[PDB]
Amino acid sequence: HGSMETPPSRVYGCFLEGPENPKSAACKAAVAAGGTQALYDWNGVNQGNANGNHQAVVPDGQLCGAGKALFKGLNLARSDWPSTAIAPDASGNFQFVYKASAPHATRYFDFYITKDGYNPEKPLAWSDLEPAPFCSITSVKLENGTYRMNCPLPQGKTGKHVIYNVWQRSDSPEAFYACIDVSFSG
Ligand SMILES: [Cl-]
């Protein structure tokens, strides 16, 4: 269990607004569509039997909710999901921070990115992501309840995008999924 905290993932950002009084238009709409229970369970956007095959278990149009009815409100095809403007530091990497509320032996954290031109009014599909991840982390250390992971960012990517993070356990077939709304500078 967990989700991305740096930058905040889509589900965790809405939880942090306060499920009883969402502020952003998108988080209000998510609560209207699927209830507060999705936000209370922000750390549980999983598929139990992924086993490294995520397209088997996460349908197109439902990536951010991982194909789960509980999380359908995360799938709204809106341009206003709150985003974080990101850039690498002077090392050339960006430091992701994952809040690991139930730490587990890890096979990988994979990071996918939306294709150039992706229109957020289109429901998010796997084919809207480049087929190969831009960053694949196979070794993580638990530090203060988190994984701090250094990734290069996708080169030449501009504007508002979705990073789709996949955490595959190595001790279980279960995986966790975090859409992360970001923007890249020119
Ligand atoms: Cl720096």
Curated annotation (Swiss-Prot):
Residues 1-183 form the Chitin-binding type-4 domain. The modification Phosphoserine is found at S185. It comes from the Bacteria. The modification Phosphotyrosine is found at Y12. It is found in: Secreted. Binds but does not hydrolyze chitin. This is Chitin-binding protein CbpD.
